[PDB]
Write a protein that binds this ligand. Structure first.
Ligand code: NA
Length: 1272
RNA sequence: AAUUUCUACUCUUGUAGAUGGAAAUUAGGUGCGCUUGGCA
DNA sequence: GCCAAGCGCACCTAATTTCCTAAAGGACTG
DNA sequence: CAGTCCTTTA
């Protein structure tokens, strides 16, 4: 029998804590004298300079290995097809194995174990890959297999006797060449990223060529016109064998540029690619265009190779290199425009247009729509005015063919200025005159305005952009005129225009060159890693490593301290601190005794020793180890062969038992290995004294992971011993010990409130109850940072005299300027009405914005592990949760939904579907986070347009979501409920933050001993790995599809069954109305009733029969109803593209226009069909579509309600405008309600099942039939 | 309007909630400029 | 003005991998 | 030569 408090201590969770370090005594002084911080940055900067140089070895070697790859991808394609064909778990595992096989085939080119290459070439790669992740990179040996310059050689020697600084970097480069299913790797990018894209490209290609064969020669011309793949036809680049030549970045770039085309410098025609050719063919809007548009018509570009440098054949602008370079160069080009008098020449040309012949001044067709939008009401007016005047001068019977010829002519021909004026009216000339002088005056007012001295201030950046906008505005104006000699251009005008047009041409690149520099991020100060010339600083906390790592911890009178022991005179000298009797003044110094993962440390210290492996290469006799063993440990060939099988799975692993299938052999090898580890642990110096009597006999462990999950907690112990006070002050004065105080806001002197959750982890780690039984472990590989300084009366409360209501942001800064007596104008009306109810604080001490960044500070990052008694990973976590849910049928459900007018909307229901609580999370704690987020995004968009600093919105999102995470888990724990989400910005981040919080949930008000306390965290969600590897369920979290959660009637489950893309023409609309049985007027109730059988109109439905065989759709009588607050609204009102529609009144109007008698309950449909009015039937169909549109919304009105078109078995038509709290209050509440109900389906189907496995996915038909069977 | 850091704060030289760091890679987005076209 | 398919640039955002180590191994020093 | 200490490991 399970309980809710049983979901604790199920798997380990690792977190990192951050603190500030406060130097003590002479600590800060000795560091400045030894130059540690100075050389820590220099070594940091040498790393950043050397990293790209070292990457040349990886990039070159990886690129060289990928050039010889030749594989047959036919098997991989068949596994992809079979998984898309049948969605069974057998085809998934077949594809996963097939991908792993191909990843290893690529990996064998790196390590040199592929049968495709000869032994001489195959062995040469192994000699490189061996020393590819250690100090052999710096020998130049690997580069000798593939010449260093003096500065590079000087950079290599900067890490002499210090190559451990690249320790984590070595792991990042193993992630590049790894064969595992990790996205950081090259084999994964080839097999699972680019090939499915390339395989899809081949299918898109052949489908287009078969339907439109003319597209074949057209694609071939694009390939020949660019010059890519000259030795390969267009059909072969869309065949599988060519993908072997698409494994390097240069080939991937050429492949992507065949799809995307090539751009020259700005302002010139671009080389089109395959996707642009298809896009233009569709925009012709002919019969062929509709066929191409029906098929897939966009090839997918391949992803880049890992670590590779992207190449492009397009033009890259020259980058301005300094601040004054843009001022000196622009002012030089700016002062050149005065001497040439290009403004006076331009002002004279546009003044010529008042008297010269305008029938020879031509406007470009590529600019006609832009000019129409800049001088007239819309882009349409000019093209339409020319259309009407040209139709006005056609000859004879103006057919519709002659009109289409006039339309097509206006798309691709230059119009003379006279025909535009004669067709648009005199008001265009006034618009042309006003716009021309407006642009000319701004350019004239900008050439004489001097540039600033520097670009330091934003006000100086603005005037540079303002003058460039005026220059680009004149450059834009000149491009209005046609340049092609196909038109009869004026002799003098075309020569003078082309002259000043080419003299304004460099201004376009100056705009882009200036923006590419002025919008660059300013230099900011960043924290950097400290080492104190110790390559393994704070690597581990063990007592055997205190001299090597030079880091220990103290706790004195509730305060925590970090001690650093630097090298004295370039030599290590472990200043042995002497434990002393208690009560003597000093610090409780921690003694950290730890033996790491036994799965690797025991083989490392015994069975994998070089002497053991070498001995068993020749001899079969046992070998006895004596070094670091209190008694000799025996290694037999039977034991050595178990951990060195030469078969991929070791015989004591579950993989061997699951692959082979012999339980007699598996349980024998498992028992013989556990007995060997017990023999090791009893004799090894680090573990011989550890009492392991709690471990059960070896033959009782079912698998090895279960044994290691019980052994590792016994290999870690922490204890404290008092140290002499006088001994540390000596070690601090001499400089042999640097002492800091591990500090945060909860250790300030004035601190008196609740602690931060991270500090409860910290104090709980060192609580005496945790030292006896370890729940939280202190982990190694900590880091120290040093970030320099970054930045450089009366105060006002944000809330009123009552603490609940806040001052609006528009009135806060105005009141703060007033109480400080620095407001330079009259105080506004409402701000003066809020004056008496305002709370003012007197500045008793300076409170400085961003105080941490104004001074230099040290920082300390240390990782910990919670739930240390549990295993590293859980086993059957979802099945453990589902076992609880079957024993707790009344577990409520919390449905979280992403709304259209709400960031997050939640709805809590009980086990039977009744709503218990519904709320929008746009605002929480009386703060509108939606408006703040939306106003922040507007500011960031305007910042990019104004070349200002953009800023950060991710810090505002996390702060909002944290308040959301707090509110959701409270509802989760109070209700012991299940959270349901949508299956796929603000919502994606909320999902991860919710899983992480429930992976290791600690409530700061619970006592440490209780479930939920710091020593017994809650674990409600499955262990997070990645989003791709996650399924439908993660513990108490569930994911359901979003379709049919909003536009669904919460009283019946009804949805709109028809797809309106198929009801397109008159004959289809007539057959659609013939599928309905009757439509008549109810005299008593006053509304219309439309009866529809679900088995009719099958060609117009979405294929979802649901559960009801028929439905009574009603045209609700447009009465005036009132909600629970007395606010009026019209029943049946619909909002369509917006306008308000009243269908029942619009229907009565239609029937009276046709004289159709309906007040006798007569069936109306046969009368409309027999009369066969084209306009009346199309209106009748539109009315039905409006009635079936439940979700009616208009942003300006604030409306977003659900109004059901069907009446339930209880005679009610649901309308969220009644504001009944028992039911959804709007459309977003209706989504969250039905999301929780989709999760209820999963829990309802779990109890009827005999297994503990949830059903994967919810089909729309199973959901509609389920929810309709319930409500009817 | 102070913070390991973030958000919201101020009866309190601080309060409430949250907080996996670092390294590495990749993908996407926003804005601007430009090219060819579409806007029934 | 909007939109489509692209290209160049500026910066912002997030997903996914690794480690969270004492001790063996061995190159260098005195 | 063996101690020291950075490098590399399971
Ligand atoms: Na607090």
């Amino acid at each position: 029998m399970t309980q809710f408090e049983g979901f604790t201590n199920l798997y380990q969770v690792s977190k990192t804590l951050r603190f500030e370090l406060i130097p003590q005594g002479k600590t800060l002084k000795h560091i400045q004298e030894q130059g540690f911080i100075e050389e820590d940055k220099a070594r940091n900067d040498h790393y950043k300079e050397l990293k790209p140089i070292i990457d040349r070895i990886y990039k070159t070697y990886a690129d060289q290995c990928l050039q010889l790859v030749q594989l047959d991808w036919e098997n991989l394609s068949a596994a992809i097809d079979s998984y898309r064909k049948e969605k069974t778990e057998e085809t998934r595992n077949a594809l996963i194995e097939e991908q792993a096989t191909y990843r290893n085939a690529i990996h064998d080119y790196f390590i040199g174990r592929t049968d495709n290459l000869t032994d001489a070439i195959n062995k040469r790669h192994a000699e490189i890959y061996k020393g590819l992740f250690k100090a052999e990179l710096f020998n130049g040996k690997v580069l000798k297999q593939l010449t260093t310059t003096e500065h590079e050689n000087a950079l290599l020697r900067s890490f002499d006797k210090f190559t451990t600084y690249f320790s984590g970097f070595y792991e990042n480069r193993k992630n590049v060449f790894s064969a595992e299913d990790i996205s950081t790797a090259i084999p994964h990018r080839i097999v699972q990223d680019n090939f499915p894209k390339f395989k899809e490209n081949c299918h898109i290609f052949t489908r287009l060529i078969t339907a439109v064969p003319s597209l074949r020669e057209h694609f071939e011309n694009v390939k020949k016109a660019i010059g890519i793949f000259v030795s390969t036809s267009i059909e072969e680049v869309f065949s599988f064998p060519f993908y072997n030549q698409l494994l390097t970045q240069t080939q991937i770039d050429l492949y992507n540029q065949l799809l995307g085309g090539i751009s020259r410098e700005a302002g010139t025609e671009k080389i089109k690619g395959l996707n642009e050719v298809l896009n233009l063919a569709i925009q012709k809007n002919d019969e062929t265009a509709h066929i191409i548009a029906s098929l897939p018509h966009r090839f997918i570009p391949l992803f880049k190779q890992i670590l590779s440098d992207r190449n492009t054949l397009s033009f890259i602008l020259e980058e301005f290199k300094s601040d004054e370079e843009v001022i000196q160069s622009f002012c030089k080009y700016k002062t050149l425009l005065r001497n040439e008098n290009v403004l006076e020449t331009a002002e004279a040309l546009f003044n010529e247009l008042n008297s010269i012949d305008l029938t020879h001044i031509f406007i470009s067709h590529k600019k006609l729509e832009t000019i129409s939008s800049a001088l007239c009401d819309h882009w349409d007016t000019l093209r339409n005015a020319l259309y009407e005047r040209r139709i006005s001068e056609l000859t004879g019977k103006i057919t519709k063919s002659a009109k289409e010829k006039v339309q097509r002519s206006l798309k691709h021909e230059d119009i003379n200025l006279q025909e535009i004026i004669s067709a648009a009216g005199k008001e265009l000339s006034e618009a042309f005159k006003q716009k021309t002088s407006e642009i000319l005056s701004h350019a004239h007012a900008a050439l004489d305005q001097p540039l600033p001295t520097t670009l330091k201030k934003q006000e100086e950046k603005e005037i540079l952009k303002s003058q460039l906008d005026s220059l680009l505005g004149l450059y834009h104006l000149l491009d209005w005129f046609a340049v092609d000699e196909s038109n009869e251009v004026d002799p003098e005008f075309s020569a003078r225009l082309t002259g000043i047009k080419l003299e304004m041409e460099p201004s376009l690149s100056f705009y882009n060159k200036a923006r590419n520099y002025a919008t660059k991020k300013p230099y900011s100060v960043e924290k950097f890693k400290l080492n104190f010339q110790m390559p393994t600083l704070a690597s581990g906390w063990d007592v055997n490593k205190e001299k090597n790592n030079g880091a220990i911890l103290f706790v004195k009178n509730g305060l925590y301290y970090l001690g650093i022991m630097p090298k004295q005179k370039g030599r290590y000298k472990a200043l042995s601190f002497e434990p002393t009797e208690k009560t003597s003044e000093g610090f409780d110094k921690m003694y950290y005794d730890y033996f790491p993962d036994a799965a690797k440390m025991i083989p490392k210290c015994s069975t994998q020793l070089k002497a053991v492996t070498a001995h068993f290469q020749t001899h079969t006799t046992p070998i006895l180890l004596s070094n670091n063993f209190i008694e000799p440990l025996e290694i037999t060939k039977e034991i050595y062969d178990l951990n060195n099988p030469e078969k991929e799975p070791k015989k004591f692993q579950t993989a061997y038992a699951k692959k082979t299938g012999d339980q007699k052999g598996y349980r024998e090898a498992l028992c013989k290995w556990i007995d060997f580890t017990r023999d090791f642990l009893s004799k090894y110096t680090k573990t011989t004294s550890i009492d392991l009597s709690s471990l059960r006999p070896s033959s009782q462990y079912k698998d090895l992971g279960e044994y290691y999950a019980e052994l590792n907690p016994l290999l870690y112990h922490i204890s404290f011993q008092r140290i002499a006070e006088k001994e540390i002050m000596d070690a601090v004065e001499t400089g042999k010990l640097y002492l800091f105080q591990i500090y945060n806001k909860d250790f300030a002197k004035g601190h008196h409130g609740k602690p931060n959750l991270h500090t409860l982890y910290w104090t709980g780690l060192f609580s005496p109850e945790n030292l006896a039984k370890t729940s939280i472990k202190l982990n190694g590989q900590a880091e120290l940072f040093y970030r320099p300084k970054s930045r450089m009366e009366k105060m006002l409360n944000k809330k009123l005299k009552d603490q609940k209501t806040p001052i609006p942001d528009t009135l806060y800064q105005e009141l703060y300027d007033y109480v400080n007596h620095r407001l330079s104008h009259d105080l506004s009306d409402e701000a003066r009405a809020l004056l008496p109810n305002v709370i003012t604080k007197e500045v008793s001490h300076e409170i400085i914005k961003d105080r941490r960044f104004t001074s230099d500070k040290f920082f300390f990052h240390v990782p910990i592990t919670l739930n240390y008694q549990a295993a590293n990973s859980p086993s059957k976590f979802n099945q453990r949760v589902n076992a609880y849910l079957k024993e707790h049928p009344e577990t409520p459900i919390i449905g979280i939904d992403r709304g259209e007018r709400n960031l997050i909307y939640i709805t809590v229901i009980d086990s039977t579907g009744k709503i218990l609580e519904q709320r929008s999370l746009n605002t929480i704690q009386q703060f509108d986070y939606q408006k703040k987020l939306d106003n922040r995004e507007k500011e960031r968009v305007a910042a990019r347009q104004a070349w200002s600093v953009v800023g950060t919105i991710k810090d505002l999102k996390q702060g909002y979501l944290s308040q959301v995470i707090h509110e959701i888990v409270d509802l989760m724990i109070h209700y012991q409920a299940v959270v349901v989400l949508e299956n796929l910005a603000v919502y994606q981040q909320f999902e991860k933050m919710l899983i992480d919080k429930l992976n290791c949930l600690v409530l700061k008000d619970y006592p440490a001993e209780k479930v939920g306390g710091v020593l017994n965290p809650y674990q409600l969600t499955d262990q997070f790995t990645s989003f791709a590897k996650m399924g439908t369920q993660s513990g108490f979290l569930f994911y359901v599809p979003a379709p049919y959660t909003s536009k669904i009637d919460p009283l019946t489950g009804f949805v709109d069954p028809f797809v309106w893309k198929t009801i397109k023409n008159h004959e289809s609309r007539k057959h659609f109305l013939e599928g309905f049985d009757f439509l008549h007027y109810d005299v008593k109730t006053g509304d219309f009733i439309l009866h529809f059988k679900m088995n009719r109109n099958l060609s117009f439905q979405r294929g979802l029969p649901g559960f009801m065989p028929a439905w009574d759709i009603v045209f609700e009588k447009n009465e005036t109803q009132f909600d629970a607050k007395g606010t009026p609204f019209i029943a049946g009102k619909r909002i369509v593209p917006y306008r308000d529609l009243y269908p029942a009144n619009e229907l009565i109007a239609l029937l009276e226009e046709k004289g159709i008698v309906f007040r006798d309950g007569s069936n109306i449909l046969p009368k409309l069909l027999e009369n066969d009015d084209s306009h009346a039937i199309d209106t009748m169909v539109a009315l039905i579509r409006s009635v079936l549109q439940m979700r009616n919304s208009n942003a300006a009105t604030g409306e977003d309600y659900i109004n059901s078109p069907v009446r339930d078995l209880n005679g009610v038509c649901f309308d969220s405008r009644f504001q009944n709290p028992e039911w959804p209050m709007d459309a977003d509440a209706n989504g969250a309600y039905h999301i929780a109900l989709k999760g209820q389906l999963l829990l309802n189907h779990l109890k009827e099942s005999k297994d503990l496995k949830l059903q994967n996915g919810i089909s729309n038909q199973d959901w509609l039939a389920y929810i309709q069977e319930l409500r009817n």
